[PDB]
């Protein structure tokens, strides 16, 4: 070896697809009590593998993959009630730094404050 072009000396040894793993959408900012939400997840680059998704929160959120973007994977999920939802997506164990990501859901609170919705 002799990269020096990083991609290996980068630091986090690339960790693998952890770099091509892209995830950006509105469902990646907030959700509402029992309201269908979704976000995009582009991939198809590192190569075949697995994608584990550990969700945690006051309720079990649903998940729905939809290949309808010409290239971006649409993962539609559904939250049940406000709180701090946490998801961990890893492409073949390539857990992105964000994972565990955070998805604050709000019931007519758009914020669910520990003083308004008071928990």
């Amino acid at each position: 070896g002799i990269p020096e072009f990083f991609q290996f000396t980068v630091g986090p040894l690339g960790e693998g697809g952890a770099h091509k793993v892209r995830a950006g959408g509105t469902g990646l900012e907030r959700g509402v009590a029992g309201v269908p939400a979704e976000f995009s997840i582009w991939t198809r680059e590192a190569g075949a593998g697995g994608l584990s998704i550990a969700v945690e929160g006051p309720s079990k959120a649903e998940i729905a993959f939809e290949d309808r973007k010409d290239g971006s994977c649409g993962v539609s999920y559904v939250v049940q009630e406000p709180g701090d939802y946490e998801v961990s997506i890893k492409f073949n164990d390539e857990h992105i730094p964000d994972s565990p990501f955070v998805v604050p859901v709000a019931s007519l609170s758009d914020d669910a404050r520990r003083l308004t919705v008071t928990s």
Partner: peptide, 24 residues
Amino acid sequence: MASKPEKRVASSVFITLAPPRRDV
């Protein structure tokens, strides 16, 4: 306060990308 219940509820599910037999 001290949330008596340990953390909130938990959930675990996922899938995997495994296209048909490679033949490209």
